């Protein structure tokens, strides 16, 4: 089961700022920045399209991995397509998550559009509880950051 979603929003921050926080430094940043994120290491590739990530994460006594696979990236239009899955017993009716994201000037900040796609096993639907996990923690990521750049 393939669900889709959109959105748009704004930032005060600039795109090329907001992009270098976000996706050059976000392997740096993510695990400083939010208590439950422990880690976010390479498994393979160069940081270009193909490779694949280790986002470690406790919460509770309890120990999460999820991989992060790079789709596409392009510093020029603020373009990171990349998908998450794993954490096997987290929410088990994901197969896979794949965002499309990029940024565009708007007003001295950022114009931000992400495109999500819920990748369901067999044609399931899309559960409300985990469509608002997921969006909640990848806003909450994206914020956070953002916040750190306003922040310094
Ligand atoms: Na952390």
């Known amino acids: ?12 921050v600039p795109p090329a700022k907001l992009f270098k926080a976000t996706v050059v430094d976000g392997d740096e940043l993510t695990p ?7 880690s976010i290491e390479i498994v393979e590739g160069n940081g270009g ?5 280790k986002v470690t994460a406790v919460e509770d006594g309890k120990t999460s991995y999820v991989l992060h696979k ?13 998908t998450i899955s ?27 559009k992400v495109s999500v796609t ?12 985990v469509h608002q996990d997921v969006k909640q923690k990848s806003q909450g990521i994206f914020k956070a950051i953002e916040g750190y750049v306003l922040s310094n």
């Open 32 to 38: 400083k920045l939010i208590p439950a994120i422990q």
């Open 118 to 129: 819920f990748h369901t096993k067999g044609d399931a639907p899309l559960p409300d509880e």
């Open 1 to 12: 089961g393939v669900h889709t979603f959109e959105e748009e929003s704004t930032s005060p």
């Open 70 to 82: 790079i789709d596409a990236i392009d510093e020029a239009t603020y373009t990171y397509d990349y």
């Open 86 to 112: 794993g954490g096997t017993g987290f929410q088990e009716i994901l197969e896979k998550v794949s965002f499309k994201t990029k940024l565009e000037a708007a007003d001295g900040g950022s114009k931000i």
């Open 49 to 53: 399209p193909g490779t694949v990530k």
